[PDB]
Short mmCIF file of N, CA and C in Angstrom, two decimals:
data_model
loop_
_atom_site.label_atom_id
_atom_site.label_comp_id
_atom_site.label_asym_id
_atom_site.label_seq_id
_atom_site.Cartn_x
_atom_site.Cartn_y
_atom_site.Cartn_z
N UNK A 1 93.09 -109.03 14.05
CA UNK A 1 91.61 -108.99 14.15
C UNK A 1 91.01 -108.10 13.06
N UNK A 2 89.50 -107.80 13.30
CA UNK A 2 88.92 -106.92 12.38
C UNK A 2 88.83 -105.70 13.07
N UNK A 3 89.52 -105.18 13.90
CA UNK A 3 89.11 -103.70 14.93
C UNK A 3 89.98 -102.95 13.75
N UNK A 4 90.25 -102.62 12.46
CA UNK A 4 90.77 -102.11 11.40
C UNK A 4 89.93 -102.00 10.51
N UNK A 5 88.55 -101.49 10.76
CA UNK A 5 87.45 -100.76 9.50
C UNK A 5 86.78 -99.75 10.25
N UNK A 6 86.47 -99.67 11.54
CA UNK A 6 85.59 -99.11 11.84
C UNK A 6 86.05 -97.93 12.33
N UNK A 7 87.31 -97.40 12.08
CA UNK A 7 88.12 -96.56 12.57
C UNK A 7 87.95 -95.09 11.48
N UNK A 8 87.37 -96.19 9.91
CA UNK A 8 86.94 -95.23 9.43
C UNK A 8 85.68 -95.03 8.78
N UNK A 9 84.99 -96.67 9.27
CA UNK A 9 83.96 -96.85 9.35
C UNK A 9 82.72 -95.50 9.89
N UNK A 10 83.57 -94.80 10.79
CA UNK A 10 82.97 -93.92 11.40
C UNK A 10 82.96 -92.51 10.93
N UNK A 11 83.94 -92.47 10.16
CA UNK A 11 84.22 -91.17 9.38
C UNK A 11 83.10 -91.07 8.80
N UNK A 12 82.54 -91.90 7.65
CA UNK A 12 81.82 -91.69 6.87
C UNK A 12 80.56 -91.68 7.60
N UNK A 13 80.30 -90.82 8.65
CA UNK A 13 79.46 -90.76 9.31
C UNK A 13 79.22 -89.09 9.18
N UNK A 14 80.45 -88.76 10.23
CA UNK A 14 80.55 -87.15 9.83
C UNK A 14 81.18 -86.01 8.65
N UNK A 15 81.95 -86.87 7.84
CA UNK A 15 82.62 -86.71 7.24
C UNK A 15 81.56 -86.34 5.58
N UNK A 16 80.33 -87.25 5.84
CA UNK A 16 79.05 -87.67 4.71
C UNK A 16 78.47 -86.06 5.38
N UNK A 17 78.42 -85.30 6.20
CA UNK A 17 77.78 -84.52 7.16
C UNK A 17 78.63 -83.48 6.42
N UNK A 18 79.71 -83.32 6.41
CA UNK A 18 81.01 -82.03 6.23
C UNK A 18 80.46 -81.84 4.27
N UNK A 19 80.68 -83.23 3.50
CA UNK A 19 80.26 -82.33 1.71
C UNK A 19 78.93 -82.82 1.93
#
């Protein structure tokens, strides 16, 4: 399936937050 992007799809959530 596609349940293999959003795993880090989500990082760049908090991760955009951390630099």
């Amino acid at each position: 399936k596609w349940a293999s992007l959003w795993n880090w799809f989500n990082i760049t959530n908090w991760l955009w937050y951390i630099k």
